[model samples]
Target: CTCISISNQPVNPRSLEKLEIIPASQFCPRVEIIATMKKKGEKRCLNPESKAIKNLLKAVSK
Candidate 1:
């Protein structure tokens, strides 16, 4: 499997419609974070290495 693109830019949680975390698997050997925008329904692949994404993940998981 291949990721088409990934954005390292921080996304505002308030503007996000939903976040989907895809775990590492045989197909794709890395964690994938997909964030969907609220207004435009745009899907963005987030970099797991970003602190903002990490915090966002923790905030939503709780």
Candidate 2:
């Protein structure tokens, strides 16, 4: 999430807060949900279940 303020002067804190609070999910629900779910470890079908899988096998091999 990149935010670029195109203002010539310093941005007002209150305005910045208001702009940031304008929920992006309302405008792009699917994309927002996918992003949130990805953060929570809902892997896509093509990928391994989790990064921990490798460590688990390594521990068992000891």
Candidate 3:
């Protein structure tokens, strides 16, 4: 069986505020994509999975 794990940096107050507005599920796909990219050498990015993360960030940002 294959397993995947995803973690985010501890959120500050401002981040927590944004997170309260954004659904937790919004980050699921990004985490899965990142885990797959890490496991396989495909999907190379200068900032690893920053693109997916950035999308989540934007959604969280007001």
The model with the greatest lDDT is 1
What is the TM-score (0 to 1) of candidate 1? 0.84
As for lDDT, the candidate ahead, 1 or 3, is 1
Where does model 3 exceed 4 Å of error? 1-4, 7-50
Off by over 4 Å in 2: 1-47
- Per-residue lDDT of 1-62 in model 3, one digit per residue for the tens? 11133345332223232131222264433323222132233322122244445565465445
Better candidate number, 1 or 2, judged by TM-score:
1
Lowest lDDT sum, 10 consecutive residues, model 1, at 53-62
What ranking of all candidate models by TM-score puts the best one first? Answer: 1, 2, 3
lDDT of 2 by residue, 1-62 (tens): 12221222222222221121112455432211111112343212111233433243343342
Candidates in order, TM-scores: namely 0.84, 0.21, 0.21
What is the TM-score of candidate 3?
Answer: 0.21
lDDT of each: 0.83, 0.24, 0.33
Tens-place lDDT digits, model 1, residues 1-62: 44589998888887888988888998798988889999979888998888898689676654
